[PDB]
Amino acid sequence: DICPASEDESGQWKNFRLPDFVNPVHYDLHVKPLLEEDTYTGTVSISINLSAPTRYLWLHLRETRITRLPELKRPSGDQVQVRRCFEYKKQEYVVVEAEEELTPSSGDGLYLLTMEFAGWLNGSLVGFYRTTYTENGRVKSIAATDHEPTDARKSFPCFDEPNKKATYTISITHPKEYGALSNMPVAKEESVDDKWTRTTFEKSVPMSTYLVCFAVHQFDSVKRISNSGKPLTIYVQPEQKHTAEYAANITKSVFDYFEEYFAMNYSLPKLDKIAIPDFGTGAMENWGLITYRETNLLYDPKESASSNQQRVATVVAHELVHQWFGNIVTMDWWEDLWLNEGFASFFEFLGVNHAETDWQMRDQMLLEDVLPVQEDDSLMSSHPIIVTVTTPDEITSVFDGISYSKGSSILRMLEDWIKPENFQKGCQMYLEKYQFKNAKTSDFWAALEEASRLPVKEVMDTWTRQMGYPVLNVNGVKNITQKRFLLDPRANPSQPPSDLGYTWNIPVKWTEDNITSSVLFNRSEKEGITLNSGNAFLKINPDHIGFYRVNYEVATWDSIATALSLNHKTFSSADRASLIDDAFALARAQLLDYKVALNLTKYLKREENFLPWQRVISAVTYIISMFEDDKELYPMIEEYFQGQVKPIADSLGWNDAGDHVTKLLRSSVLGFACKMGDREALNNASSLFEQWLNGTVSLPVNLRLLVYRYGMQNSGNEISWNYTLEQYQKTSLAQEKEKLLYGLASVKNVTLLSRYLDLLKDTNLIKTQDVFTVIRYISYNSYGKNMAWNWIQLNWDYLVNRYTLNNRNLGRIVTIAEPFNTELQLWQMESFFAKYPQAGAGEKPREQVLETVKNNIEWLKQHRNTIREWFFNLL
Ligand SMILES: *[C@@H]1O[C@H](CO)[C@@H](O[C@@H]2O[C@H](CO)[C@@H](O[C@@H]3O[C@H](CO)[C@@H](O)[C@H](O)[C@H]3NC(C)=O)[C@H](O)[C@H]2NC(C)=O)[C@H](O)[C@H]1NC(C)=O
Ligand SMILES: *[C@@H]1O[C@H](CO)[C@@H](O[C@@H]2O[C@H](CO)[C@@H](O[C@@H]3O[C@H](CO)[C@@H](O)[C@H](O)[C@H]3NC(C)=O)[C@H](O)[C@H]2NC(C)=O)[C@H](O)[C@H]1NC(C)=O
Ligand SMILES: *[C@@H]1O[C@H](CO)[C@@H](O[C@@H]2O[C@H](CO)[C@@H](O)[C@H](O)[C@H]2NC(C)=O)[C@H](O)[C@H]1NC(C)=O
Ligand SMILES: *[C@@H]1O[C@H](CO)[C@@H](O[C@@H]2O[C@H](CO)[C@@H](O)[C@H](O)[C@H]2NC(C)=O)[C@H](O)[C@H]1NC(C)=O
Ligand SMILES: *[C@@H]1O[C@H](CO)[C@@H](O[C@@H]2O[C@H](CO)[C@@H](O)[C@H](O)[C@H]2NC(C)=O)[C@H](O)[C@H]1NC(C)=O
Ligand SMILES: *[C@@H]1O[C@H](CO)[C@@H](O[C@@H]2O[C@H](CO)[C@@H](O)[C@H](O)[C@H]2NC(C)=O)[C@H](O)[C@H]1NC(C)=O
Ligand SMILES: *[C@@H]1O[C@H](CO)[C@@H](O)[C@H](O)[C@H]1NC(C)=O
Ligand SMILES: *[C@@H]1O[C@H](CO)[C@@H](O)[C@H](O)[C@H]1NC(C)=O
Ligand SMILES: N[C@@H](CCC(=O)O)C(=O)O
Ligand SMILES: [Ca+2]
Ligand SMILES: [Zn+2]
């Protein structure tokens, strides 16, 4: 009402980006939630450094309203006359026109802008919100904030860009039964009423708005102390207190490891972690107060799987990295988001590897980030690491595989090329140089270029300023040439236009007879290079350390297949995974005959290692899904691959024994046996499931998911479906809940899956954070594939209203259409998209899933006969 919306565009507030001449210095922020009412109010006073004459001052605000005329102050301290205030929706600004204009910030004096605001705590997982949980039968409340990337402006009025760093003193007025948390320690607590408390926090170091965080809670805590002597504590519901132990351990270990590794002190006096009962992302690195989804923080050794353990450790490590990369040093603009996310995605492996020794984490990078993202980045609809973003929707969209996984992957290649020691010392220099400020990608190359004097900028720009990656084509064992690798052979390889023209400076490594060599393959060597004795076989790209694929001569590929059949151990586990991965991606791209790819799978009855099985399972999953309704090809692909895993599946058995990696192997190998229709593996699943239904037996933790899924799929009915739904409500462990939801999604019953889809609208049953997870689970169901797809269409307006088009997970939900492979299905997709053309954060996902489905159609046309022949002839 007070600051009405205006469509007045004649001003700098029409610009998407904030002006250069205004830099906030300090925020005085006070908020008072009315928890039971789902409302809050607040006042914020912002000290402002002004560098140019202006009659207007503007900053970010969304949904939350200004309640009183804003108040401005001269740097001398006099009150400034204010004509109007107005909201400018198009760029999410609230604007105040002063009478005057004056431009001073010459001394140490600053302008002071004070604002009164009111917002809502309901209907959302972003900004400042409230959610509930049950304790001893009572409904309890917790309120918290979540801001990245452009939601701090929903919590309170602010200069909501990552490079507008300011300092923060936060205070909260809350009921006395509640504790209050923020970035900094508690400074002072004073009684407002006999009912209310005002908790003021100590001044923060300069930080970005997206990192500002506060919470009101009645959580218990688990405590540890760093080598630094600083308190590291995890806040947790009393009921769940025991499940905070493991996260506490890893926080300590990884906190101590990083502080030493980066040669830099953590900037704050304390560090807190807390899982909000309903939380919109995986986790958020809010400085000193890291928020989690319970599945990524809370772990029960008696109920949770090894997979869960590793996820907890990795997310914790991830969030810790940000305390340095992201928090101390922040990217200047979202285009450089990889400086945050890629670094966290890289160092997370180093952190966990220190904490957990026999986890083979460094190798697992290949499975987690490298190989999955080489799939993503082989589409035309990928994007370069440094990404132009011009709207909040575009900004949030780039929190994706490219920023995280390709970021992680090109740092992994960079480290190896530049040597670990120099990468380490280089990261340190960068960290001290830009501390409490912002950096660009160029700034990081330069830092490392001091640690090596190698041509870092020249080489790494090629991996960073254009999308995609090369395949190395091998001629005569020894000559290599580079070419852009695209999954679609019809696609124009020069598009979209790149100044670098899709050629790369490739740090190339190879193994000649257990001796390793290195060369920088230069862009300007247009006709390729020759790898520098008396050689019959060159192993190019060991451990898949470089972000590229190698296409050997067909003769060599044939010789590899035979070498594997004779003694697969001649190659390392990673090398096997890599050769298998490249071959099947090359076959997918029409760059290598499928017979040649499939020949590499012949040895598998003797494969015992995690990495190769994982990348085999990935390759087969795609191929099998393309032939799902081909009653000619499918049984043959099934019979064969069932035969190939049966020995390892049988050998490991249906029982939790062995180390971490073995237990992970068993899960995926037994899962694949089930998937391939192994009667004995399905019988184990059904038997255990039947036992679990008897309500006593606690299933082996690493078998649970498989038993819920294949158990429900093969012998589930209404009685066991209802039982499983009750169990899901009754368990406190989020990690168990999530498995049970996958179980529920696995029933072969349209009526039950319809009931399940209806539950998505019931917030008493499915949490807001879990809706897209469930839709995705249902889409994996041979009935639910089309059911989930139909439901998101029928309920699209409902979802948009619930989540907004700025929600990343909603944008991505269309990827449930990935397995589609007919012209009819493609037309369905295009028809739906044309009906709801406002895609928001779903713009890129739509482009990607369309390209995928078009590739599928083409793939089937090109390869059905070849693959049929290979299987028929073999069988
Ligand atoms: C869970 O899966 C297990 C396999 O992983 C099943 O155990 C296997 O049962 C098979 C038959 O019951 C045995 O295979 C063959 O049985 C025939 C019977 O006619 C014999 O001639 C063969 O000697 C035998 N094959 C071999 C190579 O010895 C398996 O021996 C047996 N065990 C293993 C380790 O494979 C379980 O039955 C199954 N559990 C449930 C509850 O269904
Ligand atoms: C790389 O893949 C090649 C192409 O599939 C393999 O060559 C094929 O081996 C098949 C055996 O697995 C042969 O099928 C047999 O021969 C004829 C086909 O016309 C059938 O009558 C037989 O029944 C069939 N054998 C059985 C047991 O059913 C193919 O003849 C043959 N294809 C071609 C085009 O030569 C290579 O062996 C393989 N290289 C490896 C593994 O190193
Ligand atoms: C939180 O709840 C309030 C009140 O229930 C919602 O405000 C209502 O918004 C609708 C428009 O969709 C109006 O029809 C009602 O009259 C409003 N009521 C009041 C008291 O303002 C509010 O939309 C909810 N917040 C969110 C973010 O969903
Ligand atoms: C957290 O770390 C401690 C070690 O500091 C783990 O140690 C347990 O306690 C004793 C004595 O320290 C050890 O002998 C055992 O190996 C541990 N196990 C049990 C069951 O007590 C502790 O397990 C770790 N927390 C976890 C895994 O949640
Ligand atoms: C799928 O589930 C539905 C719901 O349970 C099944 O229909 C029920 O069948 C039972 C036993 O035959 C009857 O007692 C109920 O009257 C039915 N319930 C409803 C709501 O219709 C159905 O048979 C199952 N479909 C399968 C197995 O294909
Ligand atoms: C399984 O669960 C459902 C839901 O609790 C049971 O209840 C029926 O559900 C349908 C909606 O799908 C309602 O229309 C009926 O009124 C419900 N029946 C009631 C409340 O008695 C269903 O009966 C359960 N089935 C079994 C075998 O336990
Ligand atoms: C590879 O390149 C070298 C050097 O340019 C050349 O001598 C040779 O003929 C090429 N071809 C093969 C098959 O080695
Ligand atoms: C690639 O060639 C150019 C020639 O101008 C050179 O500047 C660059 O350093 C070369 N890279 C090498 C040889 O590693
Ligand atoms: N930086 C967070 C994600 C925050 C968000 O996207 O909202 C993470 O990857 O753990
Ligand atoms: Ca967020
Ligand atoms: Zn992150």
From Swiss-Prot:
Catalytic activity: Release of N-terminal glutamate (and to a lesser extent aspartate) from a peptide
Binding site for substrate: 148, 282-286, 808
Localization per Swiss-Prot or TrEMBL: Cell membrane
GO cellular component terms, A-Z: apical part of cell; apical plasma membrane; brush border; cytoplasm; cytoplasmic vesicle; external side of plasma membrane; extracellular exosome; extracellular space
Any single Pfam family the record assigns to this protein: ERAP1_C
Entry annotation: catalytic residues: 319
Main location: membrane
Outcome of substituting residue 808 to T: In a breast cancer sample; somatic mutation
Activity regulation: Substrate specificity is modulated by calcium which enhances the enzymatic activity for cleavage of acidic residues while reducing its activity with basic residues. Inhibited by aminopeptidase inhibitors amastatin and bestatin.
Extracellular face of the membrane: 1-875
Keywords assigned: Aminopeptidase, Calcium, Cell membrane, Disulfide bond, Glycoprotein, Hydrolase, Membrane, Metal-binding, Metalloprotease, Protease, Signal-anchor, Transmembrane, Transmembrane helix, Zinc
Molecular-function GO term, any one: glutamyl aminopeptidase activity
Expression by tissue: Expressed in choriocarcinoma cancer cell lines (at protein level). Expressed by epithelial cells of the proximal tubule cells and the glomerulus of the nephron. Also found in a variety of other tissues.
Summary of the function given for this chain in its UniProt record: Regulates central hypertension through its calcium-modulated preference to cleave N-terminal acidic residues from peptides such as angiotensin II.
Assembly mode: Homodimer; disulfide-linked.
This protein's name: Glutamyl aminopeptidase
